[PDB]
């Protein structure tokens, strides 16, 4: 999961075809669990503050079940999409928190997704 | 640089063709600056300790010039290669340190490489 997720989120940010892979298809389904309202808001704060800030905060909320987890991957994916490819974001940090929160649900996420 | 490097190192670890990209070619040249002796040693300690450990340490040495930087990318790349694709390594951490050390030489690395 770890590697796949890093590639997915990154791809979702620059859309570079050469780093695309059909597994993204299934992951992209999770988008549904996330309201484009929140995403839009988040994006706005990120640009208001010129920072990872807001996103890092959302990634720090708790995750008590696989649904929680899926949502967090989704919110990362959409932010990654809408924020811009020119955005100097230290993706390693976001991944660090994100995996800290969902690492444990990886096995089940695999199953649930593939 | 940040994104390219994450993709390169990860690819160098599982060799998944679908995430391959010819820019890797140039980066792969840097291999030369790194002695396969060190890499082998490092790998051994990582397995002796069952951990990121050793690699994290090498990534923490200082980088005072672009040559230093290139070497560190190289050492990351070869470790990534020889360590194994089944190795549960939290790549986000290594990237965190690695970029902390070479982030500043990105622009010049681009130029020097492409």
Numbering used by the authors:
A (entry chain A), B (entry chain C): 1 to 114
In the authors' words:
The VACV protein N1 was first described as a secreted protein but was shown subsequently to be a 14 kDa intracellular homodimer that is expressed early in the virus life cycle and contributes to virus virulence in mouse intradermal and intranasal models of infection. Functional analysis demonstrates that N1 inhibits apoptosis both in transfected cells and in VACV-infected cells and, consistent with this, biochemical analysis shows that N1 binds pro-apoptotic Bcl-2 family proteins Bad, Bax and Bid. The crystal structure of N1 reveals that it is a dimeric Bcl-2-like protein with a surface groove that is constitutively open and that is predicted by molecular modelling to bind BH3 motif peptides of pro-apoptotic Bcl-2 family members. N1 is the first VACV protein shown to be a Bcl-2 family member and represents another example of VACV anti-apoptotic proteins.
The full-length wild-type N1 and a C40S mutant were expressed in E. coli, purified, crystallized and the structure was solved at 2.9 Å resolution by MAD analysis of the selenomethionated protein. The C40S mutation was introduced to avoid intermolecular disulphide bond driven aggregation. The crystal contains three dimers per asymmetric unit. The structural model encompasses residues 1–114 (residues 115–7 were not visible in the electron density map) and has an Rfactor/Rfree of 23.7/24.4 %. Note that the C40S substitution is distal to the dimer interface. N1 contains seven α-helices arranged with a fold similar to Bcl-xL and other Bcl-2 family members, including viral counterparts. Comparison of N1 with Bcl-xL using program SHP matched 96 Cαs out of 114 with root-mean-square deviation (rmsd) 2.4 Å, and revealed secondary structure elements representing the BH motifs of Bcl-2 family members equivalent to those in Bcl-xL. The predominantly acidic surface of N1 contains a surface groove formed by helices α2, α3, α4 and the N terminus of α5. In contrast, the N1 groove has an open conformation that could readily bind BH3 regions of pro-apoptotic Bcl-2 proteins. The dimers of N1 observed in the crystal structure are held together by anti-parallel interactions between α1 and α6.
